[PDB]
Amino acid sequence: QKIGKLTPEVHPPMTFQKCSEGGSCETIQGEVVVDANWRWVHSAQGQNCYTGNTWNPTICPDDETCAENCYLDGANYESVYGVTTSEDSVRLNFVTQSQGKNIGSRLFLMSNESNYQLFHVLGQEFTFDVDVSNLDCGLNGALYLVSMDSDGGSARFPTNEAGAKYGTGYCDAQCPRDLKFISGSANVDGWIPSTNNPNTGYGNLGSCCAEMDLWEANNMATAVTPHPCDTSSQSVCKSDSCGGAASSNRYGGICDPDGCDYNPYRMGNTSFFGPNKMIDTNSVITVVTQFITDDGSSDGKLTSIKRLYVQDGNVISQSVSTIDGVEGNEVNEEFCTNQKKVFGDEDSFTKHGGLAKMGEALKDGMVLVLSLWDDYQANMLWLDSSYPTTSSPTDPGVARGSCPTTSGVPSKVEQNYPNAYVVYSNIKVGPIDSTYK
Numbered sequence: 323q324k325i326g327k328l329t330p331e332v333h334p335p336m337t338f339q340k341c342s343e344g345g346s347c348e349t350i351q352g353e354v355v356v357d358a359n360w361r362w363v364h365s366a367q368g369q370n371c372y373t374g375n376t377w378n379p380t381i382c383p384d385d386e387t388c389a390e391n392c393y394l395d396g397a398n399y400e401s402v403y404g405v406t407t408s409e410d411s412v413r414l415n416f417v418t419q420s421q422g423k424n425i426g427s428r429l430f431l432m433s434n435e436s437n438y439q440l441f442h443v444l445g446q447e448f449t450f451d452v453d454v455s456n457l458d459c460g461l462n463g464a465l466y467l468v469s470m471d472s473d474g475g476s477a478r479f480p481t482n483e484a485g486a487k488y489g490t491g492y493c494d495a496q497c498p499r500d501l502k503f504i505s506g507s508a509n510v511d512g513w514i515p516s517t518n519n520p521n522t523g524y525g526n527l528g529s530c531c532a533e534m535d536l537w538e539a540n541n542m543a544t545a546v547t548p549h550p551c552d553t554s555s556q557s558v559c560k561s562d563s564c565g566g567a568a569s570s571n572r573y574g575g576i577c578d579p580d581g582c583d584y585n586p587y588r589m590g591n592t593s594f595f596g597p598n599k600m601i602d603t604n605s606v607i608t609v610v611t612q613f614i615t616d617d618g619s620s621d622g623k624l625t626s627i628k629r630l631y632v633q634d635g636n637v638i639s640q641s642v643s644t645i646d647g648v649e650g651n652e653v654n655e656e657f658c659t660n661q662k663k664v665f666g667d668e669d670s671f672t673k674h675g676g677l678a679k680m681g682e683a684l685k686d687g688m689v690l691v692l693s694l695w696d697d698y699q700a701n702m703l704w705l706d707s708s709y710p711t712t713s714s715p716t717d718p719g720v721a722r723g724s725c726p727t728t729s730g731v732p733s734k735v736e737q738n739y740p741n742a743y744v745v746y747s748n749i750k751v752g753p754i755d756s757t758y759k
């Protein structure tokens with residue numbers, strides 16, 4: 323993609339920490355940018371190349387014809403995207419009405435005005451605060467990590483003039499093919515619109531990389547879920563060999579679309595997480611995620627992922643599983659293989675290399691992604707309700723949270739909770755036990 327400057331591209335700033343020593347963690351001046359797929363992509367003078375769920379064929383009859391003609395512009399962060407930042411905090415609003423309707427956002431955390439901050443968390447801990455008290459069911463405030471190129475994949479593909487500064491180069495473990503630009507190219511060929519999402523279609527190119535979902539949550543539920551791939555770093559896949567949750571053939575690619583997920587509710591403890599629960603979603607939460615390596619080293623093999631929360635002067639560790647026979651409260655090889663078995667779920671995790679392969683991704687730095695969105699594909703029922711709905715709520719793995727099966731319908735959540743928002747803050751990356759104090 324080429325760059326247009328009808329509106330200047332000004333990143334909202336946000337500080338985070340690196341705890342090199344203990345221990346009074348020291349600041350760093352980051353800045354956040356929005357995924358380019360949320361941006362306006364217009365001709366020279368001056369119409370849209372892409373509208374809703376499709377490309378304009380007079381401007382874009384193919385990848386290069388399209389890419390030659392199309393420009394990516396600045397984002398009005400507060401006005402159109404409901405995105406604002408202050409000190410060490412960032413706010414994402416669900417529905418924003420300007421002169422046009424926007425829904426959610428996906429943001430990336432930079433060091434500079436040209437580079438995504440890479441986080442090397444292996445043998446470390448990543449810690450953050452978050453406010454999910456304003457979210458509700460059918461909504462997902464995700465904070466996660468993906469093996470994106472630090473420069474947005476501008477070096478590796480010459481046709482990408484925009485780079486990280488304009489939020490380019492996204493990938494995750496779904497090998498999404500709804501991205502407008504992938505590996506420099508415009509993703510025009512074989513475009514089909516999605517059957518029920520008006521903001522999305524699917525092209526021949528998908529964008530694959532390892533993804534560690536530290537946090538996918540609303541006030542009714544949460545889940546931490548590593549997704550390894552065969553090729554960890556950015557890779558292009560083609561057509562349905564991309565796999566991903568977004569197709570029928572989700573297990574047909576190089577990435578794990580399902581993950582080894584830990585949902586406190588799904589592992590049987592339904593009093594642990596919710597409004598007025600042990601972990602109170604009406605109050606701010608500190609969430610701690612430690613990545614234990616083979617020999618306690620930032621270059622060792624990843625053996626387990628641990629979860630502590632800090633709320634009201636209580637370091638509370640992750641609720642223990644209560645399902646026979648899935649013991650413990652931490653995602654490790656033992657846990658994941660058992661989890662997948664007792665729940666009759668396809669163990670794509672182990673097939674795509676389990677924790678060892680995730681370790682490889684984390685070893686190379688990863689890019690932090692902050693997002694808010696609703697779910698045309700599955701109505702967020704897999705996060706916060708009974709799933710699949712056909713199944714029995716009493717069968718193990720089925721119940722993920724309290725929400726009714728009738729929740730999560732995109733346009734019903736957009737009418738009921740358009741003003742929902744998530745606030746992430748207080749980001750820190752330092753040695754184990756050296757962030758939460």
Ligand SMILES: *[C@@H]1O[C@H](CO)[C@@H](O)[C@H](O)[C@H]1NC(C)=O
Binds near residue numbers: 591639641642
């Ligand atoms: C749920 O988890 C909390 C906090 O770990 C624990 O104190 C409580 O006893 C657990 N209860 C059940 C039923 O699992």
